[PDB]
Structure 1
Amino acid sequence: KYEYVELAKASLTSAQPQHFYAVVIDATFPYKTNQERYICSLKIVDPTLYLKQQKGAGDASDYATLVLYAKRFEDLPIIHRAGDIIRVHRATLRLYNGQRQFNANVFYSSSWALFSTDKRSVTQEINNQDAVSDTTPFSFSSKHATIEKNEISILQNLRKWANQYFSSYSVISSDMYTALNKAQAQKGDFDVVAKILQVHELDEYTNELKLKDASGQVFYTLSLKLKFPHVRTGEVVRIRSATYDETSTQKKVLILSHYSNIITFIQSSKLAKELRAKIQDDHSVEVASLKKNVSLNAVVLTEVDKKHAALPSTSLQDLFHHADSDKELQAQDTFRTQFYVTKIEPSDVKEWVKGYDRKTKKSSSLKGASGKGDNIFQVQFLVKDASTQLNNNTYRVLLYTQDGLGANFFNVKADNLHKNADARKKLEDSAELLTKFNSYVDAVVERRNGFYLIKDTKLIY
Structure 2
Amino acid sequence: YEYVELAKASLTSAQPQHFYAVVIDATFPYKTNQERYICSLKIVDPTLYLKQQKGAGDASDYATLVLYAKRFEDLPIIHRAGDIIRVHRATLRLYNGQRQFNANVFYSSSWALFSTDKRSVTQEINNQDAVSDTTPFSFSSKHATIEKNEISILQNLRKWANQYFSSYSVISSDMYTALNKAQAQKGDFDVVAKILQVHELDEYTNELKLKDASGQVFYTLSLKLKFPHVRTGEVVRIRSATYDETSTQKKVLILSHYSNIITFIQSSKLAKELRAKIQDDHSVEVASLKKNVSLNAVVLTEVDKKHAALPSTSLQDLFHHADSDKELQAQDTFRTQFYVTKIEPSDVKEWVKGYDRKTKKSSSLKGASGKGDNIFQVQFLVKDASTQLNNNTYRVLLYTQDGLGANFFNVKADNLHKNADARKKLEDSAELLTKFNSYVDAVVERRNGFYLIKDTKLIY
TM-score tier after normalising by the smaller chain length:
over 0.9
- Contact 2:220–2:254 (8 Å) recurs in 1: yes
> Could you list the runs of 5+ residues in structure 1 that have no partner in the other structure?
none
- 2: distance between equivalents of 1:111 and 1:58? 35
- Contact 2:22–2:44 (8 Å) recurs in 1: yes
- Contact 2:66–2:101 (8 Å) recurs in 1: yes
Greater shift in the superposed pair: 105-114 or 370-379:
370-379
The Cα offsets for residues 332-386 of structure 1, whole Å up to 9 and x where unpaired, read as 1100000000000000000000101112111111111133100000000000000
3-state secondary structure, aligned to 1:124:
helix
- 2: distance between equivalents of 1:390 and 1:190? 36
Give the C-alpha shift of residue 56 in structure 1.
3.9
The Cα offsets for residues 387-417 of structure 1, whole Å up to 9 and x where unpaired, read as 0000000000000111111111000000000
3-state secondary structure, aligned to 2:256:
strand
The Cα offsets for residues 198-240 of structure 1, whole Å up to 9 and x where unpaired, read as 0000001000000000000000000000000000000000000
Give the C-alpha shift of residue 282 in structure 1.
2.5
Give the C-alpha shift of residue 268 in structure 1.
0.2
- 2: distance between equivalents of 1:90 and 1:370? 83
Give the C-alpha shift of residue 54 in structure 1.
2.4
- 2: distance between equivalents of 1:43 and 1:153? 23
- Contact 2:169–2:269 (8 Å) recurs in 1: yes
Give the C-alpha shift of residue 123 in structure 1.
0.3
Structure 1 residue 7 corresponds to structure 2 residue 10: no
3-state secondary structure, aligned to 1:409:
coil
- 1: distance between equivalents of 2:159 and 2:53? 25
3-state secondary structure, aligned to 1:103:
strand
The Cα offsets for residues 73-106 of structure 1, whole Å up to 9 and x where unpaired, read as 0000000000000000000000000000000000
User: 1:152 maps to what in 2?
Assistant: 151
User: 1:61 maps to what in 2?
Assistant: 60
Question: So what's the TM-score if we normalise by structure 1?
Answer: 0.99
3-state secondary structure, aligned to 1:367:
helix
- 2: distance between equivalents of 1:344 and 1:228? 35
- 1: distance between equivalents of 2:216 and 2:87? 39
- Contact 2:375–2:413 (8 Å) recurs in 1: yes
Greater shift in the superposed pair: 24-33 or 362-371:
362-371
3-state secondary structure, aligned to 1:155:
helix
User: 1:30 maps to what in 2?
Assistant: 29
Give the C-alpha shift of residue 58 in structure 1.
2.9
- 2: distance between equivalents of 1:127 and 1:398? 31
User: 1:241 maps to what in 2?
Assistant: 240
Give the C-alpha shift of residue 184 in structure 1.
0.3
- Contact 2:408–2:458 (8 Å) recurs in 1: yes
Q: CA RMSD in A?
A: 0.7
3-state secondary structure, aligned to 2:362:
strand
The Cα offsets for residues 110-132 of structure 1, whole Å up to 9 and x where unpaired, read as 00000000010000000001001
Size of the aligned set, in residue pairs, is: 460
- 2: distance between equivalents of 1:258 and 1:271? 26
User: 1:43 maps to what in 2?
Assistant: 42
- 1: distance between equivalents of 2:245 and 2:295? 16
3-state secondary structure, aligned to 1:343:
strand
- 2: distance between equivalents of 1:373 and 1:57? 74
- Contact 2:196–2:280 (8 Å) recurs in 1: yes
User: 1:433 maps to what in 2?
Assistant: 432
- 1: distance between equivalents of 2:21 and 2:369? 76
Greater shift in the superposed pair: 253-262 or 364-373:
364-373
> Could you list the runs of 5+ residues in structure 2 that have no partner in the other structure?
none
The Cα offsets for residues 275-312 of structure 1, whole Å up to 9 and x where unpaired, read as 00000113000000000000101100000011111111
- Contact 2:90–2:101 (8 Å) recurs in 1: yes
- 1: distance between equivalents of 2:322 and 2:14? 62
- 1: distance between equivalents of 2:58 and 2:85? 24
- Contact 2:14–2:93 (8 Å) recurs in 1: no
User: 2:407 maps to what in 1?
Assistant: 408
Give the C-alpha shift of residue 55 in structure 1.
2.0
- 2: distance between equivalents of 1:306 and 1:410? 18
- 2: distance between equivalents of 1:52 and 1:102? 19
3-state secondary structure, aligned to 1:210:
strand
- 2: distance between equivalents of 1:277 and 1:201? 25
The Cα offsets for residues 230-281 of structure 1, whole Å up to 9 and x where unpaired, read as 0000000000000000000100000000000000000000000000000011
- Contact 2:316–2:386 (8 Å) recurs in 1: yes
Percent of pairs with identical residues: 100
- 2: distance between equivalents of 1:297 and 1:334? 29
Give the C-alpha shift of residue 191 in structure 1.
0.1
- 2: distance between equivalents of 1:97 and 1:307? 52
User: 1:319 maps to what in 2?
Assistant: 318
- Contact 2:399–2:452 (8 Å) recurs in 1: yes
- 2: distance between equivalents of 1:78 and 1:450? 42
- Contact 2:349–2:416 (8 Å) recurs in 1: yes
- Contact 2:354–2:369 (8 Å) recurs in 1: no
Give the C-alpha shift of residue 57 in structure 1.
7.5
- 2: distance between equivalents of 1:61 and 1:440? 42
3-state secondary structure, aligned to 2:136:
coil
Structure 1 residue 182 corresponds to structure 2 residue 188: no
Give the C-alpha shift of residue 15 in structure 1.
2.9
- Contact 2:39–2:66 (8 Å) recurs in 1: yes
